[PDB]
Design a protein around this ligand. Structure first.
Ligand SMILES: CCCCCCCCCCCCCCCCCC(=O)OC[C@H](COP(=O)([O-])OC[C@H](O)COP(=O)([O-])OC[C@H](COC(=O)CCCCCCCCCCCCCCCCC)OC(=O)CCCCCCCCCCCCCCCCC)OC(=O)CCCCCCCCCCCCCCCCC
Ligand SMILES: CCCCCCCCCCCCCCCCCC(=O)OC[C@H](COP(=O)(O)OCCN)OC(=O)CCCCCCCCCCCCCCCCC
Lengths: 171, 70
Protein backbone atom coordinates (compact mmCIF):
# COMPACT_ATOMS: atom_id res chain seq x y z
CA UNK A 1 0.00 0.00 0.00
CA UNK A 2 1.26 3.45 0.98
CA UNK A 3 3.57 5.13 3.47
CA UNK A 4 1.85 6.30 6.65
CA UNK A 5 2.66 9.98 7.15
CA UNK A 6 3.87 11.00 10.61
CA UNK A 7 4.69 14.49 11.93
CA UNK A 8 8.23 15.34 12.96
CA UNK A 9 9.45 15.55 16.54
CA UNK A 10 9.41 19.36 16.42
CA UNK A 11 5.70 19.20 15.59
CA UNK A 12 5.20 17.30 18.87
CA UNK A 13 7.17 19.56 21.21
CA UNK A 14 4.98 21.48 23.63
CA UNK A 15 5.54 22.45 27.25
CA UNK A 16 4.04 19.59 29.24
CA UNK A 17 1.75 19.90 32.24
CA UNK A 18 4.22 18.10 34.51
CA UNK A 19 2.01 17.77 37.58
CA UNK A 20 0.68 14.69 39.30
CA UNK A 21 -2.75 13.11 38.94
CA UNK A 22 -3.87 14.33 42.36
CA UNK A 23 -2.82 17.84 41.34
CA UNK A 24 -4.90 17.52 38.17
CA UNK A 25 -7.78 15.99 40.11
CA UNK A 26 -7.73 18.75 42.75
CA UNK A 27 -8.15 21.57 40.23
CA UNK A 28 -10.23 19.53 37.78
CA UNK A 29 -13.58 21.25 38.37
CA UNK A 30 -12.13 24.74 37.98
CA UNK A 31 -10.13 23.40 35.01
CA UNK A 32 -13.28 22.21 33.28
CA UNK A 33 -14.91 25.51 34.16
CA UNK A 34 -12.18 27.87 32.96
CA UNK A 35 -10.52 25.86 30.16
CA UNK A 36 -13.79 24.95 28.44
CA UNK A 37 -13.39 26.39 24.94
CA UNK A 38 -9.96 25.05 23.77
CA UNK A 39 -10.61 21.65 25.36
CA UNK A 40 -13.95 21.33 23.58
CA UNK A 41 -12.53 22.57 20.27
CA UNK A 42 -9.90 19.86 20.62
CA UNK A 43 -12.35 17.09 21.52
CA UNK A 44 -14.68 18.15 18.72
CA UNK A 45 -11.75 18.04 16.28
CA UNK A 46 -10.74 14.71 17.80
CA UNK A 47 -14.12 12.98 17.41
CA UNK A 48 -14.65 14.53 13.98
CA UNK A 49 -11.29 14.08 12.26
CA UNK A 50 -10.83 10.60 13.86
CA UNK A 51 -7.09 11.21 13.43
CA UNK A 52 -4.70 12.65 16.04
CA UNK A 53 -2.31 13.97 13.38
CA UNK A 54 -5.04 16.42 12.38
CA UNK A 55 -5.53 17.34 16.04
CA UNK A 56 -2.07 18.49 17.11
CA UNK A 57 -2.48 22.27 17.11
CA UNK A 58 -5.80 22.25 18.99
CA UNK A 59 -4.10 19.88 21.42
CA UNK A 60 -1.29 22.41 21.78
CA UNK A 61 -3.96 24.98 22.63
CA UNK A 62 -5.09 22.58 25.37
CA UNK A 63 -1.52 22.45 26.61
CA UNK A 64 -1.35 26.21 26.16
CA UNK A 65 -4.47 26.81 28.22
CA UNK A 66 -3.81 24.26 30.95
CA UNK A 67 -0.43 25.79 31.87
CA UNK A 68 -1.96 29.27 31.98
CA UNK A 69 -4.60 27.69 34.21
CA UNK A 70 -1.94 26.55 36.66
CA UNK A 71 0.21 29.70 36.49
CA UNK A 72 -2.90 31.65 37.43
CA UNK A 73 -3.21 29.31 40.42
CA UNK A 74 0.49 29.61 41.24
CA UNK A 75 0.50 33.41 41.18
CA UNK A 76 -2.48 33.72 43.54
CA UNK A 77 -3.48 30.66 45.58
CA UNK A 78 -0.45 28.35 45.71
CA UNK A 79 -0.72 27.50 49.41
CA UNK A 80 -4.44 26.53 49.72
CA UNK A 81 -4.18 24.57 46.47
CA UNK A 82 -1.08 22.79 47.78
CA UNK A 83 -2.79 22.00 51.09
CA UNK A 84 -5.72 20.68 49.04
CA UNK A 85 -3.95 18.42 46.54
CA UNK A 86 -1.78 17.01 49.34
CA UNK A 87 -4.95 15.80 51.07
CA UNK A 88 -6.29 14.48 47.76
CA UNK A 89 -2.89 12.85 47.25
CA UNK A 90 -2.99 10.95 50.57
CA UNK A 91 -6.00 8.83 49.62
CA UNK A 92 -5.49 5.62 47.68
CA UNK A 93 -8.72 6.13 45.75
CA UNK A 94 -8.19 9.93 45.81
CA UNK A 95 -11.46 10.75 47.52
CA UNK A 96 -12.96 14.19 47.10
CA UNK A 97 -15.10 13.40 50.14
CA UNK A 98 -12.18 13.11 52.57
CA UNK A 99 -10.95 16.61 51.69
CA UNK A 100 -13.88 19.00 52.00
CA UNK A 101 -12.36 21.68 54.22
CA UNK A 102 -9.24 21.98 52.06
CA UNK A 103 -11.58 22.14 49.07
CA UNK A 104 -13.45 24.92 50.86
CA UNK A 105 -10.25 26.88 51.49
CA UNK A 106 -9.16 26.47 47.86
CA UNK A 107 -12.61 27.40 46.52
CA UNK A 108 -12.81 30.41 48.85
CA UNK A 109 -9.41 31.74 47.81
CA UNK A 110 -10.14 31.08 44.12
CA UNK A 111 -13.54 32.82 44.22
CA UNK A 112 -11.99 35.76 46.08
CA UNK A 113 -8.82 36.25 44.05
CA UNK A 114 -9.99 34.98 40.64
CA UNK A 115 -13.80 35.10 40.72
CA UNK A 116 -14.15 31.48 39.60
CA UNK A 117 -17.31 29.58 40.51
CA UNK A 118 -16.87 25.83 40.87
CA UNK A 119 -19.17 23.79 38.60
CA UNK A 120 -22.15 22.14 40.22
CA UNK A 121 -23.30 18.53 40.15
CA UNK A 122 -24.22 17.86 36.53
CA UNK A 123 -22.53 20.69 34.67
CA UNK A 124 -19.23 19.31 33.33
CA UNK A 125 -21.08 16.28 31.92
CA UNK A 126 -23.21 18.48 29.63
CA UNK A 127 -23.12 18.17 25.86
CA UNK A 128 -22.12 21.68 24.78
CA UNK A 129 -21.84 23.23 21.34
CA UNK A 130 -18.57 24.39 19.81
CA UNK A 131 -18.18 27.18 17.26
CA UNK A 132 -15.08 26.47 15.16
CA UNK A 133 -13.96 27.65 11.73
CA UNK A 134 -12.47 24.38 10.49
CA UNK A 135 -14.56 22.58 7.85
CA UNK A 136 -16.58 19.43 8.31
CA UNK A 137 -14.75 16.28 7.10
CA UNK A 138 -16.62 15.01 4.06
CA UNK A 139 -15.09 11.52 4.37
CA UNK A 140 -13.55 10.91 7.80
CA UNK A 141 -13.29 7.16 7.19
CA UNK A 142 -11.54 7.61 3.80
CA UNK A 143 -14.12 5.23 2.39
CA UNK A 144 -14.04 4.40 -1.30
CA UNK A 145 -17.08 4.24 -3.57
CA UNK A 146 -19.73 1.80 -2.43
CA UNK A 147 -20.75 -0.95 -4.88
CA UNK A 148 -23.89 -0.27 -6.86
CA UNK A 149 -26.96 -2.14 -5.58
CA UNK A 150 -28.68 -4.86 -7.55
CA UNK A 151 -31.63 -3.80 -9.74
CA UNK A 152 -34.92 -3.94 -7.89
CA UNK A 153 -38.07 -5.65 -9.16
CA UNK A 154 -40.44 -3.65 -11.34
CA UNK A 155 -43.19 -4.48 -13.77
CA UNK A 156 -46.60 -6.00 -13.19
CA UNK A 157 -46.64 -9.69 -12.36
CA UNK A 158 -47.77 -11.82 -15.33
CA UNK A 159 -48.75 -15.50 -15.16
CA UNK A 160 -46.21 -18.19 -15.90
CA UNK A 161 -45.89 -18.84 -19.64
CA UNK A 162 -47.53 -22.27 -20.05
CA UNK A 163 -47.20 -23.13 -16.38
CA UNK A 164 -44.40 -24.96 -14.62
CA UNK A 165 -42.80 -26.18 -17.90
CA UNK A 166 -41.78 -29.31 -15.98
CA UNK A 167 -41.52 -32.16 -18.54
CA UNK A 168 -45.22 -32.64 -19.33
CA UNK A 169 -47.17 -30.81 -16.63
CA UNK A 170 -49.14 -28.28 -18.66
CA UNK A 171 -49.98 -26.14 -15.61
CA UNK B 1 -12.98 -17.77 86.84
CA UNK B 2 -14.23 -16.49 83.49
CA UNK B 3 -11.34 -14.00 83.15
CA UNK B 4 -8.93 -16.94 82.75
CA UNK B 5 -9.97 -17.24 79.08
CA UNK B 6 -8.84 -13.67 78.38
CA UNK B 7 -5.04 -14.29 78.03
CA UNK B 8 -5.65 -16.73 75.18
CA UNK B 9 -8.20 -14.38 73.60
CA UNK B 10 -5.74 -11.49 73.92
CA UNK B 11 -2.94 -13.52 72.31
CA UNK B 12 -5.25 -14.55 69.46
CA UNK B 13 -6.32 -10.91 69.13
CA UNK B 14 -2.72 -9.75 68.79
CA UNK B 15 -2.22 -12.46 66.16
CA UNK B 16 -5.22 -11.08 64.29
CA UNK B 17 -4.04 -7.48 64.76
CA UNK B 18 -0.57 -8.11 63.26
CA UNK B 19 -1.51 -8.63 59.54
CA UNK B 20 -3.65 -5.49 59.28
CA UNK B 21 -1.29 -3.12 61.10
CA UNK B 22 1.57 -4.77 59.19
CA UNK B 23 0.07 -4.17 55.76
CA UNK B 24 -0.89 -0.62 56.76
CA UNK B 25 2.67 0.26 57.83
CA UNK B 26 4.16 -1.47 54.78
CA UNK B 27 1.81 0.34 52.39
CA UNK B 28 2.69 3.64 54.05
CA UNK B 29 6.39 2.79 53.84
CA UNK B 30 6.50 1.72 50.19
CA UNK B 31 4.35 4.54 48.82
CA UNK B 32 5.91 7.74 50.13
CA UNK B 33 4.18 8.00 53.49
CA UNK B 34 0.71 7.51 51.99
CA UNK B 35 -1.87 4.93 51.00
CA UNK B 36 -1.21 2.50 48.19
CA UNK B 37 -2.85 3.64 44.97
CA UNK B 38 -5.92 1.56 44.17
CA UNK B 39 -6.10 0.83 40.44
CA UNK B 40 -9.19 -1.28 39.84
CA UNK B 41 -10.05 0.59 36.66
CA UNK B 42 -7.98 1.50 33.62
CA UNK B 43 -8.37 5.25 34.16
CA UNK B 44 -6.80 4.83 37.60
CA UNK B 45 -3.96 2.85 36.02
CA UNK B 46 -3.49 5.50 33.34
CA UNK B 47 -3.24 8.28 35.93
CA UNK B 48 -0.88 6.16 38.03
CA UNK B 49 1.46 5.46 35.11
CA UNK B 50 1.30 9.13 34.17
CA UNK B 51 2.35 9.93 37.75
CA UNK B 52 5.23 7.48 37.36
CA UNK B 53 6.28 9.30 34.20
CA UNK B 54 5.90 12.88 35.50
CA UNK B 55 7.74 12.15 38.75
CA UNK B 56 10.98 11.65 36.83
CA UNK B 57 12.30 9.11 39.36
CA UNK B 58 10.25 6.11 38.09
CA UNK B 59 7.90 6.13 41.10
CA UNK B 60 4.18 6.84 40.89
CA UNK B 61 4.06 8.13 44.46
CA UNK B 62 6.58 10.98 44.08
CA UNK B 63 4.13 13.84 43.63
CA UNK B 64 4.85 16.97 41.61
CA UNK B 65 2.76 20.09 42.11
CA UNK B 66 2.83 23.75 41.06
CA UNK B 67 6.58 23.98 41.68
CA UNK B 68 7.20 21.65 38.72
CA UNK B 69 5.61 24.05 36.22
CA UNK B 70 7.08 27.49 35.59
C1 LIG C 1 -67.44 -21.79 -15.82
C2 LIG C 1 -66.73 -22.31 -14.59
C3 LIG C 1 -67.03 -23.76 -14.29
C4 LIG C 1 -66.63 -24.72 -15.40
C5 LIG C 1 -66.78 -26.19 -15.04
C6 LIG C 1 -66.24 -27.12 -16.11
C7 LIG C 1 -65.95 -28.53 -15.63
C8 LIG C 1 -67.18 -29.33 -15.22
C9 LIG C 1 -66.84 -30.73 -14.73
C10 LIG C 1 -66.17 -30.77 -13.36
C11 LIG C 1 -65.11 -31.86 -13.21
C12 LIG C 1 -63.76 -31.49 -13.81
C13 LIG C 1 -62.72 -32.59 -13.72
C14 LIG C 1 -61.30 -32.08 -13.84
C15 LIG C 1 -60.97 -31.45 -15.18
C16 LIG C 1 -60.56 -32.46 -16.23
C17 LIG C 1 -59.36 -33.30 -15.80
C18 LIG C 1 -58.84 -34.17 -16.90
O1 LIG C 1 -59.52 -34.90 -17.56
O2 LIG C 1 -57.52 -34.02 -17.07
C19 LIG C 1 -56.96 -34.59 -18.28
C20 LIG C 1 -55.54 -35.07 -18.10
C21 LIG C 1 -54.68 -34.63 -19.25
O3 LIG C 1 -55.49 -34.51 -20.44
P1 LIG C 1 -55.52 -33.24 -21.41
O4 LIG C 1 -56.13 -33.60 -22.71
O5 LIG C 1 -54.09 -32.70 -21.47
O6 LIG C 1 -56.42 -32.11 -20.65
C22 LIG C 1 -57.85 -32.08 -20.88
C23 LIG C 1 -58.49 -31.06 -19.98
O7 LIG C 1 -58.34 -29.75 -20.55
C24 LIG C 1 -57.95 -31.07 -18.57
O8 LIG C 1 -57.46 -29.76 -18.23
P2 LIG C 1 -55.90 -29.37 -18.40
O9 LIG C 1 -55.49 -29.41 -19.82
O10 LIG C 1 -55.76 -27.99 -17.78
O11 LIG C 1 -54.99 -30.40 -17.51
C25 LIG C 1 -54.01 -29.90 -16.57
C26 LIG C 1 -53.00 -30.96 -16.25
C27 LIG C 1 -53.00 -32.03 -17.31
O12 LIG C 1 -52.04 -33.07 -17.02
C28 LIG C 1 -50.83 -32.94 -17.56
O13 LIG C 1 -50.47 -31.97 -18.16
C29 LIG C 1 -50.00 -34.17 -17.36
C30 LIG C 1 -49.73 -34.55 -15.91
C31 LIG C 1 -50.77 -35.49 -15.33
C32 LIG C 1 -50.27 -36.30 -14.16
C33 LIG C 1 -49.45 -37.49 -14.58
C34 LIG C 1 -48.98 -38.34 -13.43
C35 LIG C 1 -48.47 -39.69 -13.86
C36 LIG C 1 -47.97 -40.55 -12.72
C37 LIG C 1 -49.02 -40.88 -11.69
C38 LIG C 1 -50.08 -41.85 -12.15
C39 LIG C 1 -51.02 -42.26 -11.03
C40 LIG C 1 -51.78 -43.54 -11.30
C41 LIG C 1 -52.92 -43.41 -12.28
C42 LIG C 1 -54.27 -43.27 -11.61
C43 LIG C 1 -54.62 -44.43 -10.70
C44 LIG C 1 -55.83 -44.19 -9.86
C45 LIG C 1 -55.66 -42.99 -8.96
O14 LIG C 1 -53.36 -31.56 -14.96
C46 LIG C 1 -52.37 -31.97 -14.16
O15 LIG C 1 -51.21 -31.95 -14.47
C47 LIG C 1 -52.89 -32.44 -12.83
C48 LIG C 1 -52.81 -33.95 -12.64
C49 LIG C 1 -53.97 -34.68 -13.28
C50 LIG C 1 -55.30 -34.43 -12.60
C51 LIG C 1 -56.51 -34.78 -13.45
C52 LIG C 1 -57.83 -34.61 -12.72
C53 LIG C 1 -58.11 -35.71 -11.72
C54 LIG C 1 -59.45 -35.59 -11.01
C55 LIG C 1 -60.05 -36.92 -10.63
C56 LIG C 1 -59.06 -37.84 -9.96
C57 LIG C 1 -59.34 -39.31 -10.18
C58 LIG C 1 -58.17 -40.04 -10.78
C59 LIG C 1 -57.68 -39.39 -12.06
C60 LIG C 1 -56.36 -39.94 -12.59
C61 LIG C 1 -55.18 -39.70 -11.68
C62 LIG C 1 -53.85 -39.68 -12.40
C63 LIG C 1 -53.65 -38.42 -13.21
O16 LIG C 1 -55.60 -36.53 -18.12
C64 LIG C 1 -54.67 -37.21 -17.43
O17 LIG C 1 -53.69 -36.71 -16.95
C65 LIG C 1 -55.02 -38.66 -17.34
C66 LIG C 1 -55.90 -39.00 -16.14
C67 LIG C 1 -57.40 -38.83 -16.38
C68 LIG C 1 -57.95 -37.45 -16.12
C69 LIG C 1 -58.86 -37.34 -14.93
C70 LIG C 1 -60.33 -37.21 -15.27
C71 LIG C 1 -61.17 -36.57 -14.18
C72 LIG C 1 -62.51 -37.23 -13.98
C73 LIG C 1 -62.40 -38.70 -13.65
C74 LIG C 1 -63.73 -39.40 -13.46
C75 LIG C 1 -63.61 -40.90 -13.24
C76 LIG C 1 -63.15 -41.30 -11.86
C77 LIG C 1 -63.16 -42.80 -11.63
C78 LIG C 1 -62.85 -43.22 -10.20
C79 LIG C 1 -61.48 -42.79 -9.73
C80 LIG C 1 -60.32 -43.47 -10.43
C81 LIG C 1 -60.08 -44.88 -9.98
C1 LIG D 1 1.68 -12.62 68.89
C2 LIG D 1 1.87 -13.10 70.30
C3 LIG D 1 2.30 -14.55 70.38
C4 LIG D 1 2.58 -15.04 71.79
C5 LIG D 1 2.98 -16.51 71.85
C6 LIG D 1 3.52 -16.96 73.19
C7 LIG D 1 2.53 -16.94 74.34
C8 LIG D 1 3.14 -17.46 75.63
C9 LIG D 1 4.36 -16.66 76.07
C10 LIG D 1 5.16 -17.26 77.22
C11 LIG D 1 4.41 -17.35 78.54
C12 LIG D 1 5.29 -17.79 79.70
C13 LIG D 1 5.93 -19.15 79.50
C14 LIG D 1 6.66 -19.70 80.72
C15 LIG D 1 7.00 -21.17 80.61
C16 LIG D 1 7.58 -21.78 81.87
C17 LIG D 1 8.89 -21.11 82.28
C18 LIG D 1 9.61 -21.83 83.38
O1 LIG D 1 9.88 -21.36 84.45
O2 LIG D 1 9.94 -23.07 83.02
C19 LIG D 1 10.70 -23.84 83.97
C20 LIG D 1 11.49 -24.90 83.25
C21 LIG D 1 12.38 -25.66 84.19
O3 LIG D 1 13.06 -24.71 85.04
P1 LIG D 1 14.19 -25.21 86.04
O4 LIG D 1 15.32 -24.25 86.00
O5 LIG D 1 14.45 -26.63 85.71
O6 LIG D 1 13.50 -25.16 87.47
C22 LIG D 1 14.16 -25.56 88.70
C23 LIG D 1 14.08 -24.38 89.62
N1 LIG D 1 14.92 -24.57 90.83
O7 LIG D 1 12.37 -24.22 82.30
C24 LIG D 1 12.14 -24.42 81.00
O8 LIG D 1 11.26 -25.13 80.58
C25 LIG D 1 13.11 -23.66 80.15
C26 LIG D 1 12.59 -22.29 79.75
C27 LIG D 1 11.42 -22.36 78.80
C28 LIG D 1 10.79 -21.01 78.50
C29 LIG D 1 9.67 -21.08 77.48
C30 LIG D 1 8.90 -19.78 77.35
C31 LIG D 1 7.77 -19.85 76.34
C32 LIG D 1 8.23 -20.06 74.91
C33 LIG D 1 7.11 -20.01 73.90
C34 LIG D 1 7.56 -19.72 72.47
C35 LIG D 1 7.05 -18.39 71.93
C36 LIG D 1 7.55 -17.17 72.69
C37 LIG D 1 6.99 -15.84 72.20
C38 LIG D 1 7.31 -15.52 70.75
C39 LIG D 1 6.88 -14.12 70.33
C40 LIG D 1 7.59 -13.01 71.09
C41 LIG D 1 9.08 -12.99 70.84
Amino acid sequence: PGIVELPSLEDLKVQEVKVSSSVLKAAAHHYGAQCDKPNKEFMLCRWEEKDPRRCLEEGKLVNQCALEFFRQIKRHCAEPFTEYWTCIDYSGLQLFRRCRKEQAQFDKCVLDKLGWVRPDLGELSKVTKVKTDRPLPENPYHSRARPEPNPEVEGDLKPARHGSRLFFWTM
Amino acid sequence: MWFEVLPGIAVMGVCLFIPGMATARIHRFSNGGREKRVAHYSYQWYLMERDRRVSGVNRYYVSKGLENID
